[PDB]
Amino acid sequence: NEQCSPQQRTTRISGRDGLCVDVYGALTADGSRVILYPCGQQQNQQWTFYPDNTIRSLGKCLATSALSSGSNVVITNCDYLRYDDGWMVSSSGTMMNKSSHLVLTANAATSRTNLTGENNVFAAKQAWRIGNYVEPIVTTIIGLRHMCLEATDNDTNVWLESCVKNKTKQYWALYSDDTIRVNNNRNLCVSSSTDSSSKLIVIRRCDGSINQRWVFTPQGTISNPGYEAVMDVAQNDVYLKKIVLSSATDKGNGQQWTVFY
């Protein structure tokens, strides 16, 4: 079955604010940097993956340009990586150089931002969707007692309410940077507490932080991989109107979630 070992695949790579990984100006020279750019059909946003762990556009290999952090990620002649192990992509969409452990990062959200190789802190700005389909996925998020996450208090808080199909504030847009955004206000992101004294999950302006990076795991949790914790209904009690971050445990069903799209 040759289908179990496909030889290549061409796709796009989106991330921070739904922007795509793009070789700036389609420049083919070695060391030609890669940027965020609005997603399109151009060949310099087409990325081909191969079983040698390379990722290629315009015939050249995506690569870090330094051992230390903060340097641009670039395309370069693939023969320079002849003996290199290459790129490893985590479950959660972290794209990591296997040798150096630096990860693909977008230090700003705007078009033409240079992408850099940085130390992994599991920030949202280090989360990528490898895939041809780059759009935010509009969904409801169902939790304990079959209730729906709703954006409340003028899109500053979030808690469980009973599902109503029309209800505009029960809809979320899952973005390519692992952010969970308010569907009718895409500058606002579901966020883990920025106050040390609180575990309360809230809604804040998107900033690419660790706090706003969420992973929908196959075990049915909503995981923040930076803080090694998961979304939980406080006290397994939906009427407390509090969703918190907690270490994963099957104490009740407060940590189980469904994406309904």
Partner: protein, 247 residues
């Protein structure tokens, strides 16, 4: 046997049943990078079937035999009668429902076969609590006019729901709204591609989680979403388990 009854059929009891069904099916499952369990393969025929009991509003029970390799119905028992699909594994009649009067149904356990014999499609077949109860009734007495459609109902509310959290959630929505539904493009695209999605997830080990082939899954707005990798929540937080495909 694992079971579900109309006596106590709520959103909670349905969810628990589907949850435990996934557990039984994923005993001895292998796992890949995606962390979605892969069903067992090359199972000796003596251990290949999982029995599940469903009891209708008359307190009459059918026992369905699910093949643990592909999560499809091989056969079912009602009282002292049993009924095998035309594509059940040939040795299955020596292993399950042996102390019954065995019949072979005139069709396969696939939707394509059932729809041809039934002359009615999943798109036209309502799902919900009454249709669940009614299907167990029609299977119990084996009224041939309703057998095919009853399977469309139960394969979806039990096996497709087990396979896909999105489908489980459609059923939950119908249970607590007390409102029937017919499956749309979202649900049918999932059902249709379970095998292909299995192959691609397992093949993607060699391409950093990228697929060989893109799969089109529709959302609830009837928009197609191309899933060409494991990095889609509508797949990886949806598909509960996979068909074995690749070493």
């Amino acid at each position: 046997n694992l079971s579900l009854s109309q006596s106590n059929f709520s959103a909670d009891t349905y969810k628990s049943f589907i949850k435990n069904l996934r557990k039984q099916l994923t005993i001895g499952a292998s796992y890949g990078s995606a962390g979605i369990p892969i069903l067992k393969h090359s199972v000796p025929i003596c251990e290949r079937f999982l029995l599940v009991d469903l009891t209708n509003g008359d307190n009459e029970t059918i026992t369905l035999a699910i093949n643990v390799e592909d999560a499809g119905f091989a056969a079912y028992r009602a009282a002292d009668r049993s009924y095998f699909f035309q594509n059940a594994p040939p040795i299955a009649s020596y292993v399950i429902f042996t102390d019954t009067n065995q019949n072979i149904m005139n069709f396969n356990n696939t939707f394509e076969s059932i729809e041809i014999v039934g002359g009615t499609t999943r798109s036209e077949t309502p799902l919900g609590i009454m249709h669940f109860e009614a299907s167990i009734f029609h299977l119990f007495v084996h009224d041939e006019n309703y057998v095919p459609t009853s399977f469309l109902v139960l394969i979806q509310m039990v096996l497709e729901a087990a396979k896909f959290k999105f489908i489980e959630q459609k059923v939950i929505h119908s249970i607590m709204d007390m409102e029937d539904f017919t499956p749309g493009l979202a649900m049918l695209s999932l059902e249709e591609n379970w095998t292909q999605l299995s192959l691609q997830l397992q093949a993607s080990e060699s391409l950093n989680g990228v697929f060989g082939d893109s799969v089109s899954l529709y959302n609830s707005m009837d928009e197609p979403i191309g899933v060409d990798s494991m990095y889609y929540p509508i797949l990886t937080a949806n598909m509960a388990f996979q068909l074995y495909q690749c070493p």
